RNA sequence: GUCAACUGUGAUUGAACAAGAGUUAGCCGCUCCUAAGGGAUAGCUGAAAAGUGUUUAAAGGGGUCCCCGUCUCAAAAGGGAAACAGGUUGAUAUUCCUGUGCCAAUAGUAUUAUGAGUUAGAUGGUAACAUAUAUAUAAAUGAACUCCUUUACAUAGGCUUUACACUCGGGGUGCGUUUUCUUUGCACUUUACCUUUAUAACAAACCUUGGAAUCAAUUUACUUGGAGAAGAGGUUCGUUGAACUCAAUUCAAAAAUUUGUUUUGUAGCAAUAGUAAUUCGUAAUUAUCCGAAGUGGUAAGGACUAUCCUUGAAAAAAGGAGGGAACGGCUUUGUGCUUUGCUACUCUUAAUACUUGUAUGAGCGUACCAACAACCGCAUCAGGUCUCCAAGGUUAACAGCCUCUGGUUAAAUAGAAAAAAGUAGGUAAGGGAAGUCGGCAAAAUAGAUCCGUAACUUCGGGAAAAGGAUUGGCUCUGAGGACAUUAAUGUUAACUCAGAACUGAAACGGACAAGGGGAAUCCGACUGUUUAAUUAAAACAUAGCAUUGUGAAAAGCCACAACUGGUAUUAAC
């Protein structure tokens, strides 16, 4: 936080790799390391344990999700569509 | 090396037995020998 | 090796037919204390007898068939 | 001269796939009488990662229809699948995400994954992460169904052939750029013997025909016919148009 | 032992004798850990003896 | 001090070849190969190590008595006690729910 | 024993020559299991040779005729039951010897003892869970058919516990210094497996109660909580392995069985064995052997936390659960099956006797070297050659320097003389790159602490920029703990920091290690890689950008003579 001006969480990368790539990495990593709200117990502890899998620690349960975030806009729309029909 | 095989051990013991010098009495009625440092068994 | 607290059980183990020998030794001041270790094939069973009166009573009580071993 | 790398790859050798991390073949449930006439509901008991596949596998328990006790399958995990999710498979199964249904029983414009080119071939198509096919039409007298491949291509398959409702897990994986050469190494370590991927033009012309030239010339067309010999097929085979794509 | 007697008197130590970093001489994390454990120990004793309330304890 | 060595070879500290140095009654500092420590047997659903069951290696678990191995309560070491209860509730209530459906239907 | 030749000098030496001796295993390895792999059967091709390997099969196991099934070799560091302590030889010892154990099997029948159950399958605990202490924790019904689990696993960072090691201080022993001074220096003060070791202790996990926003409990780190936290009281696992009342005894109290006090005891193993001693000669005795603590170096475990577009072998073998097939003994009709009449019997460990092939422990390895001469290098070759063990002082330090244990003073030679010249080194007035291909070589810089730090910049860096200052020895002062007496007073510790005097040839990172820098241009972005013995770069890789083809067994792309493979445990992310 109160260390770097603009590179923030990609400051560990900072001395290496193109700035635009570090910008692209920053957006993805912000999503990646976020702790999501669990549908199966109501706490914001849901973390990614491997690429497609987001596990709640508290209720010990594996939700399949996107690579860098819990759900794609595509899957939500598909789910919604199926309920709609 | 340090651990051994029964066939190898037997043959090596044979080669050692063969190595030792001729009976002196035989000359009264020695062409080949090996030395371990300069001649290995070639096995 | 196994410590046996119960003297009566120790006597019972002595009376058992597998048991063969009595290793008994007196220990000096740090007063005489006596350690008796009793030899069954399965284990060597140990009782520490505090005083002479205990020690004489056990030595007499033990069967005469048992082989008595003294280090001196 | 000396055999080119792509031709050398088919001799088998050290170019066989790196299957050690991989958890078994990812083929769906086989067709049976119970699937054909009715439906079976199963429970997703665990979700597991395979690195050869782009997305997780799902361990699904069914109970042996012909016998007794519990039997374990390996399905490709749909996005929004969860441990303890109930998965239904068969002709009379209800329409819902991750269910395994004949394509004939999908309403049009639905999004599906794990298609098979023939019934009971066990999900041979549409297997990669984040991917999906769309149902684009249903035959008037039935029997055939029209679907749209994730390439955007349209194809007509029999209605009887199965597919799996929804989109494959681990979507957006390609969106992150590759950070570094070690990350690329870790990717190829679980894939195939295929890397570093050296330029052909750099080499001797003897050992790659794009090679030679004192200042690294190509010296000949890079657009090759599909009628060409295998050792001549180094360049861009059957290239209809070249240059930057535009329009 | 004469040197250790000098070290006990604090006299063996000297500024230019040092060649290790300030951290290598005495570890900052370790010093922090000492202070935290003593402060938390102190707070718990004050709570146990009930000379402060839970609110004051937690804030401190 | 002094130097030491293994009496079984395999001096590299592998998964199985671990060692505890020890001083003898002869005053000799020697090395003894220490028995292989393990992880713990797990509840079926939750993958959680179970109360009342000892974590003994499978040789020691073969030599161990049945009281050491398992618990009289319900499905023993298979699944944990809280977990069993909830599953029993679910199995009973769903049969009740099924019975309500049967009553409703006719 | 030894000296013909060899031991690039000498040689009485020897890793040379001659004569013998010597390696001892139910428990250590191999041996066993599966893997990456390899070889085949089944097939099918190919003149054959071969190329392939469940793939168009009438095939190893379990069950009262039925149900299952490709085989086989492949790890001396993966998996894998089970042994240690002391002694001993001219040479081996986990293996010989003495002591103590541990493991697997261990047939039939009859006896016996051990606990069960009967007049066909124990119990407690609300619960988490617990319960057989028989010489011996043995024995706590259960078939088919099922389901789990152990085997069985990444990396990084801290935190923590134990052990060995290391240090100080005290008592005890002997030796050493001892003009002078030293209540001094050194040495020794030992303790294993095994006893599901018994307990104690603690990080965790779980349970009963409990019912929380004024959030609390709480770690270095954040963690946890009405999907029940704090609190209170338990229970379990794992560490550990005699801790602690642990056991005995004693007297006092509880009480028809439990606590307090005394006396004992290295908990058994265990002192008889080890060590330092002490006397007495054919080889024997005697005396000794223990009180506090600190450092945090090794190693292991633990609880954790974080990272991966990478999530980190398997089987043999072993274990747990589901299920509910089966079921007293005697007498008797009818057909091993059924109904009547009667009531010490049915289990279960261990021991014994008697019979049945001879009813216990397979086979192989175990010397020595591991290079300072034993291996590879054509050779006692300054070369190469895997792994573990890791003392003291200085210090950040497994660095460098010196030291103790242990080792050595041999290196294909010595002596005498000492100039050139050589080679490995030093050193040099005054100037300071005028040198040459080029400051090459060499020198200067250099450690810490305190200051101060620019252009420029993808804002991360630049950077230890640049550029300064300080640093010895002594005598003081301050800061930083732990325990217990009601805020003060006591008992008591490790070392590190900061400040001040004095002191000296201002010398002091003293030896020791130890950036030369700046201003620029140019190329390659980068970490990476390369021409084994004239080549490390500006070449190559690399992320990034873009392109082509391909929707699938009649596809793409590649292999094979053929049949057939590979990409492919694949599927347009």
Automatic annotation (TrEMBL), chain B:
GO BP terms: translation
Molecular function as annotated in GO: structural constituent of ribosome
One cellular component term from this protein's GO annotations in UniProt: cytosolic large ribosomal subunit
UniProt xrefs under Pfam families: Ribosomal_L39 (PF00832)
Coiled-coil features, chain-numbered ranges: none
InterPro entries reported in the protein's UniProt record: Ribosomal_eL39, Ribosomal_eL39_CS, Ribosomal_eL39_dom_sf
Keyword entries, A-Z: Ribonucleoprotein, Ribosomal protein
Family statement: Belongs to the eukaryotic ribosomal protein eL39 family.
Name of protein: 60S ribosomal protein L39
Species of the source: Plasmodium falciparum (isolate 3D7)
From TrEMBL, chain C:
GO MF annotation terms: structural constituent of ribosome
GO cellular component terms listed in the entry, alphabetical order: cytosolic large ribosomal subunit
Highest taxon of source: Eukaryota
GO biological processes: protein-RNA complex assembly; translation
Classification via InterPro entries: Ribosomal_eL38, Ribosomal_eL38_sf
Annotated keywords: Ribonucleoprotein, Ribosomal protein
Matches recorded under Pfam families: Ribosomal_L38e
The keyword Ion transport appears for this protein: no
Family per similarity comment: Belongs to the eukaryotic ribosomal protein eL38 family.
Protein name, entry field: 60S ribosomal protein L38
Species of the source: Plasmodium falciparum (isolate 3D7)
Highest classification ranks of the organism: Eukaryota, Sar, Alveolata, Apicomplexa, Aconoidasida
Automatic annotation (TrEMBL), chain E:
Extent of the signal sequence: none
Taxonomy, superkingdom: Eukaryota
Similarity-based family: Belongs to the eukaryotic ribosomal protein eL19 family.
Protein name: 60S ribosomal protein L19
Species of origin: Plasmodium falciparum (isolate 3D7)
Organism classification: Eukaryota, Sar, Alveolata, Apicomplexa, Aconoidasida
Whole-protein residues included: 63 to 122 of 182
Automatic annotation (TrEMBL), chain F:
Residue numbers binding Zn(2+) 2: 43, 83
Keywords annotated in UniProt: Metal-binding, Ribonucleoprotein, Ribosomal protein, Zinc
Residues where Mg(2+) 1 binds: 67, 70
Binding site for Mg(2+) 2: 70
UniProt GO cellular component terms: cytosolic large ribosomal subunit
Highest taxon, organism lineage: Eukaryota
One of the GO BP terms on file: translation
Binding residues for Zn(2+) 1: 43, 46, 80, 83
Membrane-spanning intervals of the chain: none
Chain intervals for the UniProt region annotation (Disordered): 1-25
Skewed-composition ranges (Basic residues): 1-21
Family: Belongs to the eukaryotic ribosomal protein eL34 family.
Protein name: 60S ribosomal protein L34
Organism: Plasmodium falciparum (isolate 3D7)
Section covered of the full-length record: 2 to 107 of 150
